[PDB]
Amino acid sequence: AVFYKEHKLRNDGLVITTNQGNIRLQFKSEAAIEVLYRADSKQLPSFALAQPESAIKAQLTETENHLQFSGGTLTARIQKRPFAISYYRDSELLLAEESGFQVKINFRFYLSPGEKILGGGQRILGMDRRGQRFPLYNRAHYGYSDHSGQMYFGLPAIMSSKQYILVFDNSASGAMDIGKTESDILQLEAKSGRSAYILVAGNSYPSLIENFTQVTGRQPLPPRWALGSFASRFGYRSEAETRATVQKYKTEDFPLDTIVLDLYWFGKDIKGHMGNLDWDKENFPTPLDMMADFKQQGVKTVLITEPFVLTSSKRWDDAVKAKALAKDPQGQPKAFELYFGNGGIIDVFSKEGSRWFSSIYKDLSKQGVAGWWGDLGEPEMHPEDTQHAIGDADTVHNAYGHRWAEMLYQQQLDQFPELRPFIMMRAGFVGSQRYGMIPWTGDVSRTWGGLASQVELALQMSLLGFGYIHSDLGGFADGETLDKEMYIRWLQYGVFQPVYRPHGQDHIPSEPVFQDEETKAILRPLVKLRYRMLPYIYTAAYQNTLTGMPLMRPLFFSDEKNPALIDNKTSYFWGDSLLVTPITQAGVESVSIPAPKGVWFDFWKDTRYQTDGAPLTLPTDLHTIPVLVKAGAFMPYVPAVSTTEDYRSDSLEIHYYADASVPLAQGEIFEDDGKDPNSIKRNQFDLLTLQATHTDNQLHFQLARTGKGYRGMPERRATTLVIHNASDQYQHLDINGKTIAIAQADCASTPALACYDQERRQLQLVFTWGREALNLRLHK
Ligand SMILES: C[C@H]1O[C@H](O[C@H]2[C@H](O)[C@@H](O)[C@H](O[C@@H]3[C@@H](O)[C@@H](O)[C@H](O)O[C@@H]3CO)O[C@@H]2CO)[C@H](O)[C@@H](O)[C@@H]1N[C@H]1C=C(CO)[C@@H](O)[C@H](O)[C@H]1O
Ligand SMILES: O=C([O-])C(=O)[O-]
To answer: Keywords in UniProt for this one?
Structure first.
């Protein structure tokens, strides 16, 4: 039995006193409220909030039975007796507490009938997790395939079809019960930790996500090389093998930006060496030369690191001496069994552990390491009696990886203020994206089921802050011989998801350069396509940094009034314009694509489809996966390069998909130096915009550039604009008012400025795009 007793509005927070204690409400923005119970006691701080001490001006009004605490769009309605808080956007109820807070920590909310609930981070349970319950406890799930209620990277957060996001801002071992035990009840539980939740509202799914990342953090733009081709396996055994692999990419003519060194870089065996955090010189004898030699070829080196320092490693004594490891209640360094051996865990929550760990990253970075891979941050093994500076293992568990990323991010920015950190990790918390965390979906099995689960996982993570979620392409775990068709399908999908990193246990090759001739013939032009599409991908990355908009978007974005679309985990949007349907079973001969109503084109074949709702049936082939382009799309390309270090935008090729059903369309291309972490903030970029206006007798393109530019920016770009499904009735082109004839023959065989290819229904315009506004008008 809880009831209101009194409140105090100071400042700018609402502090309510019930018969059970104090509750603090603070708006972190016009659309987001933090609600802290047991406010009067000392608790762990928020981890989810980027600005935890924020509190914007809200209006408070009181009635006999209620208080109202209202921000711009979100309003908290506080019922006095019994005590219950409910949340409104406009006049629409978003979410209501049932019993609300109870004591070990428990939050209970009503769920609406028919309300669909995404969230929980990585689970393989279906997109709508309502009817499910599962732990909040980051944990490895080795060799998972088509089901999981608990894996590496959980998030204590949900997204509702009511268009709100609820965050349980708690780092402890806990649980989420989404109307499983009781049909109309959402229950959040934790053994300890902070007793707070955060509700974020939005008027659309993109707006919801923009509002959510506003308060939890926006991902800094990754270096452009993060979007390129990675060579990886578990693992290169020597410097010779590593150099041979870089060489294999060169001789096989596959693009390569980065090679990733797994745990053999610091030891001869899988077990016993973890914590050495230094080169195994027997097998990597000249690592500085190795990294310098790779940089000469435009190739970065990334090294794996882990939280665990084994008692058998060379750094045990020093870590103990430095007080860098978590302790037992008795006060000694805590040592325990984990897969890799016997050892302790670096206390990243302590000053000592942070300084000790950070100095190691600095030293290796100075030697030439370009980026960092932090594995096992669940932490994979984390005994209950382990004590960190700010709480026991069960209390801080779900934030360990989060803090580890913060430490490393801060360390990298302090060391290299003019470069963007690359940090790939397996586990984090809400908001970890603000430290640049790039997560991958762990040790997936080498099975079709493992591949088939990746879109669900990526969408679930993307919706809640993580634009660069991706998988070990081709699959990681076990297997005894390559499943060739599966591998190909996985690396094809790979082109259209955030990070192109094939990786697997090395008894089967994960790199595409080690595959048979047929596989390479299929994948080589696709890996090159990935590079040619850098302007499209890097622009989506830019938008993610701006607004939180994920690179992969769910089908349900296409119709917010059709909740049934939420269930779809088989087709997704890659950027604004591509609808991608991965093939996830062997021998599939055709696919049914639930394309949104409108006009769509086969990405590979240029075929035009129109639909008023019925799905489209496309045949499959082994060399592609089915991809449709939305009418009105501007698809920008540059020539393929071997490494993003060689990237040029002097030559642009842009494909516009024309249809009268799209009378107005817009595109943009974000260009900067690919490396400056301050480029966006300082406007040191070249933002290209294209606008198409398509009427009965005219098709008009307006081109412009903004931004202050950057060193090496081309003043003038040679541009080839290819208009698909172009009318055959255009007779002339005006460029800035100067009329030019459109040739109607030999379009591919002459250096023509404007030509129409009647067999392909493509109209090609070739011109110079300088710094001034440029207008192109086609007239019938
Ligand atoms: C490569 C991974 O090694 C370790 O995984 C162990 C795992 O701990 C064992 O339990 C597992 O046995 C499983 C069983 O758990 C059972 O669930 C399943 O049905 O049978 C399996 C029998 O093989 O054995 C594996 C070792 O093969 C470790 O826990 C795990 O984190 C490791 N993966 C990470 C480490 C590396 C290597 O540095 C990275 O390459 C990888 O990307 C990373 O995720
Ligand atoms: O759309 C058009 O104008 C056409 O196809 O002729």
So the answer is: Glycosyltransferase, Signal, Transferase
Closest approach atom of ligand 2 to CA 729? 6
CA 762 – ligand 2 centroid, Å: 12
For 431, the token pair is: 């908001």
C-beta of 394 in contact with ligand 1 (< 6 A): no
What values do phi and psi take at 136, rounded to 5? -100, 85
Is 378 annotated in the active site? yes
* N-term to C-term CA, the chain: 76
- Looking at ligand 1, which residue's alpha carbon is closest to its atom 14? 142
**Do residues 725 and 778 make contact, with C-beta atoms less than 8 angstroms apart?**
no
CA angle at residue 285 from 281 to 286, to 5 degrees? 130
Ligand 1 centroid from CA 262, angstroms: 14
CB within 8 A of 308, min separation 6: which ones? 274, 275, 338, 340, 343, 344, 345, 346, 376, 379, 381
| Alpha-helical segments (H) within 339-428 | 351-367, 393-396, 400-415
Per the CB < 8 A criterion, the answer to whether 641 and 255 are in contact is yes
What is the β-pairing status of strands 92-102 and 105-110? antiparallel
Cα distances from 702 to residues 364, 579, 705, 734, in angstroms, run 49, 26, 11, 12
Catalytic annotation, pick one of 169, 280, 306, 378 = 378
Q: What is the C-alpha to C-alpha distance for residues 456 and 578, in angstroms, rounded to an integer? A: 17
Ligand 1 near 142 CB (within 6 A): yes
Do residues 582 and 455 make contact, with C-beta atoms less than 8 angstroms apart? yes
DSSP 220: P
Distance between CA atoms of residues 667 and 633, nearest Å: 7
For ligand 2, atom 6, the nearest C-alpha belongs to 727
Nearest Cα neighbor of 624 from 607, 642, 602, 654 is: 602
Q: Which atom of ligand 1 is nearest to the CA of 304?
A: 38
Q: What b/e readout covers 692-707, taking b as 16+ CB neighbours within 10 angstroms?
A: bebeeeebebebbbeb
Known catalytic membership, residue 517: no
Give the span between the Cα atoms of 487 and 264, in whole angstroms: 25
The experimental method, as deposited, was: X-ray
Instruction: Give me the amino acid identity at 513.
Output: V
Return the closest-CA partner of residue 95 out of 113, 110, 77, 114.
Answer: 110
Give the separation between CA 269 and CA 340, rounded to whole angstroms.
10
Identify which of 640, 370, 389, 302 has the alpha carbon closest to the alpha carbon of residue 495.
640
Q: What's the Rg (C-alpha) of the chain? A: 27
Place of tokens 């001490």: 53
Tell me whether residue 728 is annotated as binding: no
- Respond yes or no: is residue 676 known to be catalytic: no
Location of structure tokens 């799309």: 633
What does the block give as tokens for 699?
């098709």
Specify whether the CB–CB gap between 228 and 641 falls below 8 A: no
Secondary structure letter of residue 596 according to DSSP = P
Q: Which residue has the tokens 């499910």?
A: 132
Q: 3-class DSSP state for residue 81?
A: coil
- Token pair listed for 506: 């090395």
Please answer whether residues 228 and 470 qualify as being in contact, where contact means their C-beta atoms are separated by less than 8 angstroms.
Answer: no
Q: Whose CA is nearest to atom 3 of ligand 2?
A: 727
**Amino acid identity for residue 764 in this structure:** Q
Question: Resolution of the deposited coordinates, in angstroms?
Answer: 2.0
DSSP 8-state code for residue 459: H
State how far the Cα of 672 lies from the Cα of 654, in Å rounded to an integer: 18
b/e 500-520 (16+ beta carbons within 10 angstroms → b): bbbbbbbebbbbbbbbeeebb
Contact 328, 385 (CB under 8 A): yes
Q: Looking at the chain, after which residues does the C atom sit over 2.5 Å from the next written N, breaking the chain?
A: 103
**Catalytic residue of the set 34, 97, 239, 375:** 375
Which of 729, 762, 778, 779 to mutate for ligand 2's pocket (most ligand atoms within 8 Å of CB)? 729
